[PDB]
Every structure is written in structure tokens, then in C-alpha cells.
Amino acid sequence: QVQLVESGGGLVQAGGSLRLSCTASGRTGTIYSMAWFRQAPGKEREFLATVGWSSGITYYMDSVKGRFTISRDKGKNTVYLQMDSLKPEDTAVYYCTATRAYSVGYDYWGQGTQVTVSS
Amino acid sequence: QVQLVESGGGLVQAGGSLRLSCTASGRTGTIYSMAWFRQAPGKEREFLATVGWSSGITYYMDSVKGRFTISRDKGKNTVYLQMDSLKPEDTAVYYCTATRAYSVGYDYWGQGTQVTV
Numbered sequence: 365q366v367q368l369v370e371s372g373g374g375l376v377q378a379g380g381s382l383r384l385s386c387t388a389s390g391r392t393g394t395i396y397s398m399a400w401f402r403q404a405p406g407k408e409r410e411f412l413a414t415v416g417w418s419s420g421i422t423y424y425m426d427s428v429k430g431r432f433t434i435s436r437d438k439g440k441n442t443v444y445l446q447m448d449s450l451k452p453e454d455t456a457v458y459y460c461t462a463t464r465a466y467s468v469g470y471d472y473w474g475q476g477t478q479v480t481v482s483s
Numbered sequence: 484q485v486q487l488v489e490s491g492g493g494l495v496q497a498g499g500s501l502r503l504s505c506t507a508s509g510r511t512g513t514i515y516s517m518a519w520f521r522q523a524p525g526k527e528r529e530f531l532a533t534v535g536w537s538s539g540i541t542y543y544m545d546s547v548k549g550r551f552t553i554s555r556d557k558g559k560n561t562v563y564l565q566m567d568s569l570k571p572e573d574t575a576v577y578y579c580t581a582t583r584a585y586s587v588g589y590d591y592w593g594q595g596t597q598v599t600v
């Protein structure tokens with residue numbers, strides 16, 4: 365009942381920047397917060413960052429804090445992940461998620477978008 | 484505004500099980516949910532499982548879904564993580580967190596506890 369579609373993934377060079385997007389459709393009024401995950405090849409899905417869907421307050425895991433910036437545009441139904449100072453270990457399939465109000469965890473997921481960083 | 488302390492954990496053999504625990508104090512009524520993460524040496528903290536502090540709803544990453552079981556006991560201010568069917572890839576320091584109502588992310592953190600398979 366809520367659909368998420370990531371875009372923005374591509375190949376970038378070390379030290380450069382990329383911005384991901386995720387467009388939400390369906391009953392978006394039932395979403396409390398949005399988060400980006402990533403899954404490197406062979407590894408497991410890693411939580412990165414979250415934004416309050418109506419608050420705009422943010423929280424970052426240490427691995428991306430100070431480099432990445434999460435934000436949301438309620439009017440356009442989109443959440444962003446600004447990625448600065450990328451490095452090879454940021455190479456991964458990035459997923460966006462939404463958590464519903466009074467639910468817990470990560471109720472909806474996108475297909476995933478691929479980010480690749482060279483040296 | 485909230486302090487967490489974790490307990491349990493230690494040494495286990497392949498295929499076995501462990502039980503972890505964590506106790507909260509302070510402004511405990513303003514806690515919406517609690518979660519468990521894990522960090523292996525040199526790696527990054529990985530989110531594992533979550534439980535609603537009032538509701539009891541739960542959710543798992545595919546990495547531990549089925550094998551681990553999270554739960555809470557609200558009056559004793561204590562959360563647990565029951566880990567069954569353990570593999571060497573579960574070796575890590577496990578951390579418990581709390582998320583405050585109308586906040587996001589992981590606002591309070593325990594000091595961690597060691598699991599070795």
C-alpha cells in the first residue's frame with residue numbers, strides 16, 4: 365500500500381559526490397520516518413541514516429556521519445541522500461525504506477539502486 | 484536522560500544459543516522502541532532487530548530472521564535478545580539502543596557486550 369522507487373545510483377570517482385533520491389507513492393500520510401540502507405557485494409544490509417518524515421530531524425551512523433546528509437521534501441514526496449567525499453568502501457546497492465506510524469522496523473522497501481566508487 | 488546497561492553474552496559453540504539482556508533507567512516512559520546492533524572488529528555497527536516498547540511489535544533483518552528472537556518486559560524495564568542456531572559470522576560486540584518518542588534514530592546506547600562463536 366506504499367511504493368518506493370529509488371533512483372540516482374551511478375559510478376563516481378573517489379572524493380566526489382552523488383545524490384540519491386526515492387519517490388514515495390500510496391498512503392504516504394501513514395509514514396513516520398524514512399531510512400537509507402546499503403548492501404555491499406557479499407555483505408549484509410547496513411542501516412545508515414534516518415529522517416523524521418514530518419520533523420526533518422536527522423540521525424547518522426558514525427560510518428557516514430559528516431559525509432552524508434539525509435533530507436526530505438514533503439511536497440514532492442521524496443527523500444534524498446546527499447553523499448559527499450565518497451570512497452571505494454561506499455560501493456553498494458542502496459535501498460530506501462519507510463516505517464509506518466505506530467509500526468516498528470522497516471515496513472516498505474524499494475528495488476535498490478547501485479552506487480560504484482573507484483579509487 | 485536515559486541510561487542503558489547490558490548483560491549476558493559470552494562464549495558459545497557453533498550451533499548453540501545465547502541470551503542477552505539490557506536494563507533502562509531515567510525517563511523510561513518516553514521510550515518508543517529499543518533495538519540491537521552488532522559490531523565486529525574493524526567493521527561498522529549493523530542493525531539487527533527491533534521491538535516496540537509499548538506495542539511489542541517486532542521486525543528482523545534477513546541475516547537473523549528466524550534464528551534470533553527479540554522481546555521486552557516493560558515493568559522490569561528490560562529488553563532481551565534470544566539468539567539461537569549460532570554461526571561463526573555472529574561473533575561481534577552487541578549493543579542495545581533506545582529511541583525516544585518523536586525522535587528518530589538511536590538516541591541512547593549501552594556500553595556493549597561480547598559474543599564469540
Ligand SMILES: Cn1c(=O)c2c(ncn2C)n(C)c1=O
Nearest residue numbers: 396465466467515584585586
Ligand atoms: C520513534 N518513533 C515514534 O516516536 C513513533 C513512531 N510511530 C509513531 N510514533 C510516535 N515510530 C515508527 C517511531 O519510530
